[PDB]
Design a protein around this ligand. Structure first.
Ligand SMILES: Nc1ncnc2c1ncn2[C@@H]1O[C@@H]2COP(=O)(O)O[C@H]2[C@H]1O
Ligand SMILES: Nc1ncnc2c1ncn2[C@@H]1O[C@@H]2COP(=O)(O)O[C@H]2[C@H]1O
Ligand SMILES: [Zn+2]
Ligand SMILES: [Zn+2]
Lengths: 517, 266
């Protein structure tokens, strides 16, 4: 129940077993549904695009992110400057806790506003054209104003809740990759990334700051960088680069600018800002609130899955639209040269409306009308019967209908259907890989199924990835001195980021087969 | 036992098949009021015919996604309606007579109804059903409007529905094939693969017809149930008590007679 159990390859080059105590708060936070969702997404992503060389690195990074998320959740968990500060922290924690409820409230308010907008009417006469609500009850007119104000307020609170809930994870991440690239790869000491890496060029503003890591746990990254690289690349120059006084060892507007520049490049933060912008524009023109109905795609998981079929082959869809444009252009260049007389779109005999006397006009006519026509341009241009170019015209029309109407639209249909099939196959492959192999050691279930429920026992008690995450958290919370021998071994080996204590291809059973038998 | 009878009747009235038969009876009674109520019984072909059930399983497998994509269609058409009601109101005159206009987009509700009803059923979208935009200042905006409507609504979303149905067909076929393959390649009781039993000729067939027959296990359970407690032999009484405690460890998991006595059978 409270007892954790992990297996590592120890200093003796043998698989061992480590027992430790798991906190109930940590267990509850791990079983929390959003953490479970993050774990499922991580598993799916690594199984799709991951290799054994980087699998453990990605796993440890995911564990670190999860631990920081647990810290944030515990921080925001609910239990004249002083009263102002306590009220402010209470309010900010409330918004962080209720971010998702506020998002759903914004969606509901958008639906309510647009349902009210279904009652607008335009008239020349006042209630120049005026827009007004025509409904019997008379409550929709003030309800719309109240709901628009409430929706703007909810969007603002959603931005604040995001800033207080999900920005810290982004900052912690970016700080941790910057620290790792600086102290392992020497990205700025030796590599000096060019102007192409906009992230690397922007990250220069934080290296010399008083607190380069503020969300990242490793607060000794500057010391580590100094020790590792200064002795070879100039101790004084390294200290100048990192903005640390060497003499201070014996005895933040710039960082705020860096953090804000990082936040303003966040996709989710930018989406929430656009949501706020259209909420503000709704008070200028209420119909701008219709742009918030696009939030259903962002919100609903089923809608996201359905639209993933469209976006999976989005590049091929754009390419086939361009191919359609080119093919229709070729039909237009043939028409403008040989079939100009058939493009009269005027019933009146007095004034012609030739739609193919101009190349631009003929191309526009073709793209607009012949692609939306069921049988192609032959429905929309003059009948070719009783003419010298009749067979040429029927070949033209039939090839247009085949290549454009049938073949290219079939290509689009098949792209969408193949996207459906490919996504389904990806999900099935991830599920099969998880069912038939162990995440940590990669040993198949055929070996563990020698005993009844052997694979279940192995993946629930011996090599539980949740157990490994719990062990990492336990090491982090534990003090350095209190470490046992195995704990200190794995702690130092993790601080060096060597993922060889994770048992690769070996397990306790595969080691002591004879002695367990 | 009136209370038990009430409980049983409340259980029966929540049975799906019993409720379906009750509805069948209700429409049969309503047929004598209006004979055309007997047409509601033609829906019974879906309930009855296995082929029809299999065919409609393709529609119902992705039913949630079909409902969601219909809702997405409604939202997208609403967005096209909010654009039309603001910028293209003059093109929605559906009256041939010049004297009396029939503007279909002077009301937001009317324009949304027009869009959903007509532009989704039109082959090329709303551009077939509204006024031609040629010779107008908003001509390029109107052609972009019409072409995006035809692409996103007529092509993309109907393609999504088509693909949902086709993928349901494929997924159901794959499920049937996977079940058949699992039964062919593994034993139901012990889970040992056919590759091990195929050491001897027809070894897997012998194992699944004589050694670990699930029908045989069911027959043994029935035989124990019919047999009296006293008449049980030692093994019969052991398995009987262990079943009464509902411990399913007497079912051989991962082991068989051959895998046990390989040397002594050889
Ligand atoms: N190291 C692992 N830890 C947990 N689950 C694993 C591991 N390796 C494979 N799995 C499988 O992944 C499944 C995810 O959760 P389940 O409870 O379905 O059971 C799990 C196992 O079948
Ligand atoms: N324990 C089992 N009992 C019966 N059939 C099994 C068992 N395990 C696997 N099978 C397979 O399932 C098939 C169902 O009926 P068949 O006569 O086709 O042959 C059977 C075997 O191939
Ligand atoms: Zn394992
Ligand atoms: Zn068997």
């Amino acid at each position: 129940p409270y007892l954790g159990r992990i297996e590592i390859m120890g200093a003796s080059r043998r698989i061992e077993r480590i027992y430790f105590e798991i906190s109930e708060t940590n267990r509850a936070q791990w079983e929390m549904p959003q953490v479970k969702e993050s774990k499922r997404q991580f598993i799916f992503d690594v199984v799709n695009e991951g290799g054994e060389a980087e699998k453990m690195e990605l796993f440890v990074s995911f564990c670190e992110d999860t631990i920081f998320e647990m810290q944030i959740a515990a921080q925001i968990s609910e239990p004249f400057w002083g009263e102002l500060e306590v009220q402010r922290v209470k309010f900010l924690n409330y918004l962080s806790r209720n971010f998702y409820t506020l998002r759903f409230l914004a969606l509901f308010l958008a639906f309510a506003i647009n349902f009210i907008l279904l009652f607008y009417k335009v008239s020349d006469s006042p209630p120049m054209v005026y827009y007004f609500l025509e409904e019997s009850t008379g409550y929709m007119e003030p309800a719309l104003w109240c709901l628009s104000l409430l929706h703007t307020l909810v969007a603002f609170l959603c931005i604040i809740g995001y800033n207080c809930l999900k920005v810290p994870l982004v900052i912690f991440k970016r700080e941790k990759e910057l620290a790792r690239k600086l102290e392992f790869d020497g990205l700025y000491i030796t590599e000096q990334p060019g102007d192409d890496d906009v992230k690397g060029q922007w990250d220069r503003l934080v290296l010399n700051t008083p607190s380069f890591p503020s969300n990242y746990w490793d607060k000794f990254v500057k010391r580590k960088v100094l020790d590792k690289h200064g002795d070879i690349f100039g101790r004084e120059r390294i200290a100048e680069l990192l903005g640390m006084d060497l003499a201070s060892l014996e005895i933040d507007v710039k960082y705020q600018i860096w953090k804000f520049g990082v936040i303003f490049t966040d996709n989710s933060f930018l989406y929430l800002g656009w949501y706020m912008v259209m909420s503000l524009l709704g008070h200028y023109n209420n119909f701008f609130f219709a742009a918030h109905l696009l939030d259903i795609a962002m919100g609903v998981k089923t809608l996201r899955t359905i639209l993933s079929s469209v976006t999976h082959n989005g590049k091929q869809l754009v390419m086939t639209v361009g191919l359609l444009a080119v093919v229709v252009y070729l039909y237009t260049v043939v028409a403008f040269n040989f079939f100009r007389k058939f493009y009269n779109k005027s019933e009146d005999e007095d004034e012609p409306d030739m739609k193919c006397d101009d190349m631009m006009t003929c191309y526009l006519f073709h793209m607009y009308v012949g692609v939306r026509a069921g049988g192609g341009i032959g429905d929309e241009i003059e009948d070719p019967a009783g003419d010298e170019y009749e067979l040429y015209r029927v070949v033209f029309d039939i090839t247009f209908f085949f290549f454009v109407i049938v073949i290219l639209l079939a290509i689009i249909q098949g792209l969408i259907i193949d996207a459906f099939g490919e996504l389904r196959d990806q999900q099935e492959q991830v599920k099969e890989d998880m069912e038939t192999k162990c995440f940590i050691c990669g040993i198949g279930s055929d070996y563990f199924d020698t005993t009844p429920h052997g694979f279940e026992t192995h993946t629930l008690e011996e090599h539980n990835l949740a157990n490994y995450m719990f062990f990492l958290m336990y090491l982090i919370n534990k003090d350095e001195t209190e470490h046992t021998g195995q704990e200190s071994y794995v702690w130092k080996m993790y601080q060096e980021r060597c993922w060889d204590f994770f048992p690769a291809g070996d397990c306790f059973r595969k080691q002591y087969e004879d002695q367990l038998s």
